[PDB]
Ligand binder design. Structure first.
Ligand SMILES: Nc1ccn([C@@H]2O[C@H](COP(=O)(O)O)[C@@H](O)[C@H]2O)c(=O)n1
Ligand SMILES: CC(=O)N[C@@H]1[C@@H](O)[C@H](O)[C@@H](CO)O[C@H]1O
Ligand SMILES: *[C@@H]1O[C@H](CO)[C@@H](O)[C@H](O)[C@H]1NC(C)=O
Ligand SMILES: *[C@@H]1O[C@H](CO)[C@@H](O)[C@H](O)[C@H]1NC(C)=O
Ligand SMILES: *[C@@H]1O[C@H](CO)[C@@H](O)[C@H](O)[C@H]1NC(C)=O
Ligand SMILES: [Zn+2]
Ligand SMILES: [Zn+2]
Length: 418
């Protein structure tokens, strides 16, 4: 039993659409909808539209009014909205990051925050470079009030840094720019090691290894396989394999990992080369509810809070908060509710890797009531009469339990493939 509980927030993929507004021509409500009629728009947004400022605002207002205390906050990026490149620019990107960064800093003057860059936090999107740049330097200025000179230094070099936490200074947050590894990123094609991030990672980890230090990885694009499709890593396979090895090697140091990018609530469990679970990974869903017209599903906006043991930074639990957008628009109020408490709904001990690996196995049971939950929660309770066939479920399961491609294919073939 632990004598006090550490808590920190994780917010991601804010995707602000400064255009949003209610008007009678639903093609004009928000530029992110790209000309489509916004399905049923309200003051807190629309499924076809990125986040109106007031949604983003209510999310942070709920945190401040939450009645939870927190040592820090993790912010995994993607702040500009989904509109085509010509419609945007480097300066707009920066104004948007600036607004977010300021808005947070105003409401949370005393709170430390550790950002990571996402793939839309650049113009043109996804083209995050190896060497310094206007955006990298822009954010370094904006995030000074939360970071070292040492941190800040590397931040401008290639979009990344690492940082002891003020209120727990043997906890080091490592913020990675995994956008360097994202498919669409033309800057990094054919590069052995973009911005020497692997070198610096291997280096930064090895260093924490010795100094009795625990590490939390923060980043935007997760490692592993995208769970709602077949044999597609989120990053470039090549890098995913490379990163997994690194995490394998130093898993004793890493006490948790945290990502966004997918806009969905997901867990993953890294196993050692031997096949034994050794690191827990957590992909938090987005604040924006945005989606394609052809897509049945999306997320409800979401916000989450983690719990740790201040001694070893072991992960005790996670509480997932959300907005029932439809309701929130019907009432025209920000009723940020609690969706679930992780150890409660799944009836497991903690967030250790063995704990979660065990839950994963329970999912594999024919008609697992457990997996059913996990799939409601996967789209942040968005439709709850939602269902899932054997194949989709297989693609989820394998993703949760297999991070590198050997073991992901074994899991796929095992049951069954073209
Ligand atoms: N509404 C949305 C928005 C993004 N996505 C997916 O999640 C990822 C989100 O990346 P961005 O947030 O950088 O667009 C994309 O790879 C996209 O395929 C989705 O499935 N539904
Ligand atoms: C998980 C949850 O809250 N789901 C609800 C449903 C309900 O029918 C709808 C109408 O308000 O709003 C939201
Ligand atoms: C941020 O953006 C929104 C709309 O674009 C505006 O109403 C809000 O006041 C701005 N706030 C800051 C701190 O820039
Ligand atoms: C949007 O809404 C109006 C009213 O339903 C409709 O007549 C019009 O065709 C729609 N336009 C598009 C692009 O969907
Ligand atoms: C999975 O994807 C990679 C493409 O990156 C491919 O080379 C590999 O052969 C594929 N595996 C299967 C089972 O098709
Ligand atoms: Zn995003
Ligand atoms: Zn993204």
């Amino acid at each position: 039993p632990p004598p006090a509980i550490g808590q920190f927030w994780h917010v991601t993929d804010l995707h602000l659409d400064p255009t949003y507004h209610i008007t009678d021509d639903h093609t004009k409500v928000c530029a992110s909808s790209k000309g489509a009629n916004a399905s049923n728009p309200g003051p807190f947004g629309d499924v076809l539209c990125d986040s109106p400022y007031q949604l983003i605002l209510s999310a942070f207002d709920f945190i401040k009014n939450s009645g939870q205390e927190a040592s820090f906050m993790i912010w995994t990026g993607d702040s500009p909205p989904h509109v085509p490149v010509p419609e945007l620019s480097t300066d707009t990107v920066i104004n948007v990051i600036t607004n977010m960064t300021t808005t947070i800093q105003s409401l949370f003057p005393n709170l430390q925050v550790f950002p990571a860059l996402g793939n839309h936090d650049y113009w043109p999107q996804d083209q995050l470079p190896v060497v310094t740049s206007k955006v990298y330097n822009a954010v370094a200025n904006l995030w000074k009030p939360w970071l070292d000179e040492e941190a800040i230094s590397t931040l401008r070099k290639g979009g990344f840094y690492s940082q002891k936490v003020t209120t727990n200074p043997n906890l080091r947050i490592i913020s990675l720019n995994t956008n360097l590894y994202y498919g669409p990123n033309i800057m990094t094609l054919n590069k052995t090691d973009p911005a020497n991030q692997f070198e610096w990672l291997e280096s930064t980890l090895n260093n924490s290894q010795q100094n009795k230090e625990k590490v939390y990885i923060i980043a935007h694009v997760p490692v592993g396989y995208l769970p709602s499709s077949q044999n597609i890593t989120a990053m470039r396979e090549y890098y995913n394999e490379k990163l997994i090895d690194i995490f394998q090697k130093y898993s004793d140091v890493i006490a948790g990992q945290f990502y966004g990018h997918t806009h969905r609530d997901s867990i993953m469990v890294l196993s050692d080369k031997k096949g034994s679970p050794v690191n827990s990974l957590f992909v938090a869903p987005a604040v924006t509810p945005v989606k394609s017209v052809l897509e049945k599903q999306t997320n409800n906006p979401g916000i989450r809070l983690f719990q740790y043991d201040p001694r070893d930074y072991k992960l005790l639990d996670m509480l997932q908060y959300y907005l029932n957008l439809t309701e929130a628009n019907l009432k025209g109020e920000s009723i940020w509710k609690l969706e679930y408490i992780l150890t409660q709904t799944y009836d497991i001990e903690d967030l250790q890797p063995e704990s979660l690996y065990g839950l994963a196995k329970q999912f594999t049971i024919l008609d697992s009531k457990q997996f059913i939950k996990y799939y409601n929660y996967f789209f942040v309770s968005y439709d709850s009469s939602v269902t899932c066939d054997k194949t989709c479920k297989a693609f989820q399961i394998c993703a949760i339990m297999n991070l590198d491609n050997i073991s992901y294919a074994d899991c796929l073939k095992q049951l069954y493939i073209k």
